[PDB]
Design an enzyme around this catalytic site. Sequence first.
Site: not given
Ligand SMILES: [Cl-]
Lengths: 597, 597, 597, 99, 50
Positions: C479, C486
């Site tokens: 992605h 995070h």
């Molecule tokens: Cl993610």
Amino acid sequence: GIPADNLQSRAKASFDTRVAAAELALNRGVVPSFANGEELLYRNPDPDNTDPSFIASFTKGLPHDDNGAIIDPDDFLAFVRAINSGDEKEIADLTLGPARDPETGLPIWRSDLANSLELEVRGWENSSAGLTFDLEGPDAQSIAMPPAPVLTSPELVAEIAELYLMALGREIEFSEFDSPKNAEYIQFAIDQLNGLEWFNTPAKLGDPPAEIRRRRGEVTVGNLFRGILPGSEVGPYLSQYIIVGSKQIGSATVGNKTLVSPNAADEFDGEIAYGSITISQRVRIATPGRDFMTDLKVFLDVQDAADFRGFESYEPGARLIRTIRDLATWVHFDALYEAYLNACLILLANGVPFDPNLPFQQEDKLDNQDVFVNFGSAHVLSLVTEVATRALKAVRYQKFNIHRRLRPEATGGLISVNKIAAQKGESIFPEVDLAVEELGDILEKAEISNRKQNIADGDPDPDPSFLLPMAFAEGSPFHPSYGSGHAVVAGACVTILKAFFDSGIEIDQVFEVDKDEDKLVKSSFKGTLTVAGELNKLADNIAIGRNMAGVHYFSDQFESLLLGEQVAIGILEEQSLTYGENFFFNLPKFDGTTIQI
Amino acid sequence: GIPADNLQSRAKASFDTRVAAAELALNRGVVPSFANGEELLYRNPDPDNTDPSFIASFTKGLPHDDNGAIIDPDDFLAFVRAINSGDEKEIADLTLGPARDPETGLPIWRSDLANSLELEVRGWENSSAGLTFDLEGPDAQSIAMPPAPVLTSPELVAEIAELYLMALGREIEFSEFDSPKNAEYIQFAIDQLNGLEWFNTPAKLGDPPAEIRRRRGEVTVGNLFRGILPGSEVGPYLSQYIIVGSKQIGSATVGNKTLVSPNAADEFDGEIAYGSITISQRVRIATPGRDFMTDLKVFLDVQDAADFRGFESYEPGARLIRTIRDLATWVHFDALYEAYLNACLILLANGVPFDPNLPFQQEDKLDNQDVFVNFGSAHVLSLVTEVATRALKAVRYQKFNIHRRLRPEATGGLISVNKIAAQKGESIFPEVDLAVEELGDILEKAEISNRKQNIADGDPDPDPSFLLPMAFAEGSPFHPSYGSGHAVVAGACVTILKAFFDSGIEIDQVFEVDKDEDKLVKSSFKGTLTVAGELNKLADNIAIGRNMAGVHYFSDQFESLLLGEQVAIGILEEQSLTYGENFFFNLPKFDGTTIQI
Amino acid sequence: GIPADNLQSRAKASFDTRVAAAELALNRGVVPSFANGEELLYRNPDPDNTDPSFIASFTKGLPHDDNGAIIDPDDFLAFVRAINSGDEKEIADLTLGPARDPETGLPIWRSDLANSLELEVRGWENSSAGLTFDLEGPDAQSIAMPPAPVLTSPELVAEIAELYLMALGREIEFSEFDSPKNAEYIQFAIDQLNGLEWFNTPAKLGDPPAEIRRRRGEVTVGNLFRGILPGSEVGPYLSQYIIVGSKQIGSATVGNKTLVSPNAADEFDGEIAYGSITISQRVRIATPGRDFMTDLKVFLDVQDAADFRGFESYEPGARLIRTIRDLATWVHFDALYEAYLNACLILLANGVPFDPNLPFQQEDKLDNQDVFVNFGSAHVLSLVTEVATRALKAVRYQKFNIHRRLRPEATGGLISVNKIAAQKGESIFPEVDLAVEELGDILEKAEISNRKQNIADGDPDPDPSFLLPMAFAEGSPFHPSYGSGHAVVAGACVTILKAFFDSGIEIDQVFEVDKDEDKLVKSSFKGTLTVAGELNKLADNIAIGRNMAGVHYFSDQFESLLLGEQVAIGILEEQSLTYGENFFFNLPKFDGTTIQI
Amino acid sequence: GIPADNLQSRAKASFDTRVAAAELALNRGVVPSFANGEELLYRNPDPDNTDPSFIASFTKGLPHDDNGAIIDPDDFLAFVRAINSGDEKEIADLTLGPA
Amino acid sequence: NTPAKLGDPPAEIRRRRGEVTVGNLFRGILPGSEVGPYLSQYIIVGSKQI
Ligand SMILES: [Cl-]
Ligand SMILES: [Ca+2]
Ligand SMILES: [Ca+2]
Ligand SMILES: [Ca+2]
Ligand SMILES: [Cl-]
Ligand SMILES: [Cl-]
Ligand SMILES: [Cl-]
Ligand SMILES: [Cl-]
Ligand SMILES: [Cl-]
Ligand SMILES: [Cl-]
Ligand SMILES: [Cl-]
Ligand SMILES: [Cl-]
Ligand SMILES: [Cl-]
Ligand SMILES: [Cl-]
Ligand SMILES: [Cl-]
Ligand SMILES: [Cl-]
Ligand SMILES: [Cl-]
Ligand code: NA
Ligand code: NA
Ligand code: NA
Ligand code: NA
Ligand code: NA
């Protein structure tokens, strides 16, 4: 296309009916309630002091000084805040009763008697019930009672005069108002009241309309101690429904045959047929001549919450209401709807027809329909009782949230303290100067009466006392004087009964209580009584019974009756949306007009 | 910003409170009611005929043939349409009673008795009250009673057996169920019921849950003719609240002083203190041994609307309920809430505490607050009475709009006609074949009893009759059997009382009526009764009283009790939105669980 | 009448509460999100061609040419449509991976390694999660991240420089940043970054406010590779909460007695008490010096979806995080909320007080109330974890629907291809000319490092490669780069923890990892750390760990942290409507201000 | 014309989605909870006493006698009121622990 | 040692336990709890490692 209605589910129709009744009640609008202005008017007389005294407000339960004035104005101001909040913690935080002993927590009373009995305090009865909503009828706060009489007014002087005359007359028999043995006292009462401006001068143009309606004129033996509802002033003092029994089981017409109960005579001996059992009209007999709160220390202890409830003595047995005191005893303990439920049971047992504008009231060969659940006995029996609590919420609003009027005992306290101080050339409670000035003759009789009571109670040489003698050891309930729970329920209940029955029906035989025996005798009254008139008279009997006990004034009762009538009318109107039938209640109101609902 | 609520006007808050209660009731949703299938099952036996017979439906008032079957099925079909419409004209158009005499206009009866009295017809009592809405509580149509027992069922055979045993037992004294003089009859009753499958076999997996709940097991002297509400089967048959009086005015504790009423003994002689007057628990005494509708022609006249109301005779005086017939007399004329109002007055006079989860129930030195209008005596006195009419609307829906179940007299009529025809080798009403087959011994006793009655009534040689003897000359009220007005009101009213009082309070001394005199004696019962138990038992007493009179079956009463409990619970729930205080009612329900509302 | 609120059913109050929270979120309004303009800016250099190149967009998974540019612009345009639709069929219709063999369906990779492993493709991870709604918190699309740095910008040159320095520094121990053996490399890093305009020149008036806030100044050993949240730049590099264990079961104060766990030393040896079991802070040890995607063919295969996940090797055992690579390994596999849940467990075990503006936080002798479900440990444990998915939906919206920024590996690919072409006098990817021009010294070190890696991987004489070495065999997740899963979860989670605990509490003893052994040593830091500062530092550690792995840039992380903070704040605000208590969370924000919710 | 749905703003769609979930939960309806009857069943054995004992109710924290029965039934009744109110002051006013 | 009876509360019927054995002693009645070892695998086993 042809204009139409549409069906909807039963559940939506039920919901929409309940909303439509709430909408009807909302659309009536609301009115404010105005107090008489006394609460911030009277000031503490102490020169360096900027507090109200609250002497004309109900402060029973807050700690009072030696003159009967509250010691700390914050205690009343806190009580008023708690009344408007209803919060249980805030109520429990109030100051109730006199100073307590730090070590044992005991309240220290003024009187030896209260201390020897180890009395504890009693608390206010539903001081925030005027905040409660209801699923039916006018909201408690939507309607009003007008300002109460002020202590300085001719109306109040007349009111308190009347209450002392009732107190000193407690042993007079109703059936002997006009008897030679009572002529001296009865004429004294009549003449004293006729000597007061309220009774001997009419209202004047520009007076408040509420005063005009409730003002009384010439006192006579025929109206002495009576109410002013239409019907109350005709015929015997006591309503038929508080002394007569009813037709009994076993008396019946079955086609062309008449059966006669083996117990038929019980009708004339004070037994109401109550289903298949009975109610006796005979009242318990409080000890004749024993009154309460005639000593200042005991009086102040009662003002300070001392719980004397249950202290009265009685003679053995029971009798048809005989004396003024017996009407006071009747109203000490009645369920508030009791008189009217009993009247309703009499009317039902005697076969008095229902209001002929209800449905199904014809012979069943014509209508194929008899009545019970709706438009019949079960219907009226629930409706006459259910209105009581709705009327009580509204009168609690007036009692506590609006007017907070002092009970008659407290007014008597002001009068006594004032007169004792004036005899030493001091002015205390000048607010009651007019009553002291005008009721000298009545007060002297009370002084003598009080001395006798205080001697009997064990004080061999009592200080002079002009207190209003109480029929009940605890004096008034623990809530303000204006209005009255009894009278508001009376107004609501007899409204339902007059609407539900054919209340134009005339009474056949009129009775009174015998002068010599505990029995009924045929009255000499020549005239016609109706069911509505005798229901109004019943309401007035219960309401004035409270006055005869020393716990309400005339204005409390009359204005409460009107409030109760409004509550009942509103319930009937809202309930009218729930029925499919084509009918209405014809209701003769207290004001002489009829509303069809 | 800090999240908040906002105030609005009192009038809007009252409106919104009433809407929120209506919304709570709507959000409960609704359930259908299912009938037992009989109405279109049983067919006219006429071969050339495609009509139902309606023999298991209530058809009292419609013209019947010589066998007790309605003559014209359109008469019943029109009555059903009138029940669902409520329209007064449509009701007035129904056919009620038999052909009338041209010259006098009077109904032409079958019996010489009815004709000699020139009886007129009586009509249906509020046949559409099940259409009426209410401002509070579950709408009449929102709740259900389950299908009634069918004529062919073991449950019905058991029910009608029990009713004949009660009828033939009407002169037995409660106090003497276990006495030697009654042993032969009591054992006959117990053995006969134990001989029936309903009582001697348990329900089976797969049976309807309503049957499982109401099914009864082994009959004993301890459960004979009792109900199944918890508390009814422990201690004496009659609730304390229908035989004991109360504490009397004058008995009280004032601090450390005890006062004793001069008429304290009245408590133990059946006098309830009712305010300052009294209620007597003593019931009028219907003539012992006199039953009604034991002749087929008189029975049919009653089925054809002949108005025998008022025809009973009585002995002089009154007594504490003594016999089975006396409990039948008690329920003949009671106001429907009378038993529970009387219990409530006993509990109040005796000082039984209110439910301790209500507010303000502590000593006033702690809470500064006593109770009356809300959470005290006036509150319960209105609430116990107001639920009655709401419960009655719901039971009228079940009675007339849903189930239309025939009254026990009509079942007895089917049995009698069937048995008489079978003795002549004809089959009439095969629907009751099983009851005829199984209740031979009971029916033989009824035949003997009926012959004696018919001779006493002036027929020197009566035809055999197996009719169910009625305690009342008119038999059942003019409305269907399922459910019962008495029982639904009992359920609603004792629900209110159990919730409002601390109904875990234990009974101190248990009484019964003396075997030999009209007075109370201390019971020998050795366990513990509670107020909730004795209130349940009172409900069962009034409900079964109707059965003992001949006018309801066991299932009618039990299912009506449950319906009344649901009505009262719904009223409490909706009313809970009207108060600001933090409190709840703890209610022990008939099923043994507790709901806090 | 007195203004009032009205009650309603619990069910309506619950519904209205949920609607009020939705209304609160709606009333916040929404803001647009702006991309940086690159996606249609850069064009295919081919003269006869009118297509964008999409070279600065995330295109991992679409088939790339030999230079790392997508072959068919329709493949990216289709991917963008699928991102905005979310429809599963449309997603399954995309082109993913390189050309497949017609006969066998196998993807034909460029690298011998990928072909010998028979790798298949991996797919995009929730490319439309930014369309998903949520029952609580700001809708994914209501909030924004600002445009990402462009390839031609000084900020990007600084960012990618930093990432190459981190990559080449992966074997440096945190505890030895300032050690002589590392002086040459550490000073090279510091001096190189200080040679770049981003770091050595301040923002200027008129620059975007987001740039001004996130721009960094002078690089020092004290700030090298650190974040900029307040607290991150004080004391040791690693948060206490990622290296220290906690108090253990058995250590307690019981009244006046102190008990000491038999396992007390485990606190200092990296064991968190996790209920009655434990968590070890010791991380698995990826093979030192082994990096990935240093060969162009393997790199391009990864860009073409080759699934290398799981290919890394490890040394035996586990140790307290020691090197830069170990922080990269920590963030390779953590549950996204793991670090913060672990911090929460440390704080709980150590008895750190909750925020004192929550209710019930006093000694129970004062408040009679302890906390667990609400305002206590169970409450925070659910709340810290539940925010993660809400934050992830918002960052997916930014990742895929808005910015689609290329991951650092792809930027390294552009740099490598450009520099190799420039050495042959050809211009490829002129967009990264500035980075190539300015980072010559860093790129030469990467070339040498890459040669060693490519030799170790089995190519005896590799072509020169300037790729950014990856810590993970598969490089970045599937992605886009902007923002980071995070970092958004870190921002949301530490927001909850700082609000819920008393996060002004100071740390007593500060530890670091020992230079010589796998153990903790007391830090030399002289200064005060707080819970809030160490929570911010933890967030920065996890976020920068991704950068140290080669998979995010500085701006990705910082902007994601801010987005996560917004999500958590919105959830707290909406949830504040659900509680009756009077309380609030005090939250110190990343910007140094405090919001009270 | 062909029947259709219409788009609205993302913000309204998010609001309407949250309302539709609240509506789904409201449309489930509610059920009462019934307690087992013990709380007002068991009575203080003291003959001169009209209080429940609360012996089968949780009364941990309220002062108990030597047999483990609460000393003052008002303590439990007040705890029940505090449970249903939630008010912090009312909770702080309860009696907790012995003299 | 006795089963619930027709008419008992449905909640009692559902939760009532029968004959105690070593295989069910001190266990629950959720489906799966009474088969195999007393402790769930998930409270004693570790997992696959990195
Ligand atoms: Cl993610
Ligand atoms: Ca009629
Ligand atoms: Ca109290
Ligand atoms: Ca605490
Ligand atoms: Cl419906
Ligand atoms: Cl209207
Ligand atoms: Cl009152
Ligand atoms: Cl009017
Ligand atoms: Cl208003
Ligand atoms: Cl609702
Ligand atoms: Cl009825
Ligand atoms: Cl329920
Ligand atoms: Cl609800
Ligand atoms: Cl808002
Ligand atoms: Cl904010
Ligand atoms: Cl939008
Ligand atoms: Cl829904
Ligand atoms: Na009557
Ligand atoms: Na009238
Ligand atoms: Na109870
Ligand atoms: Na922990
Ligand atoms: Na903080």
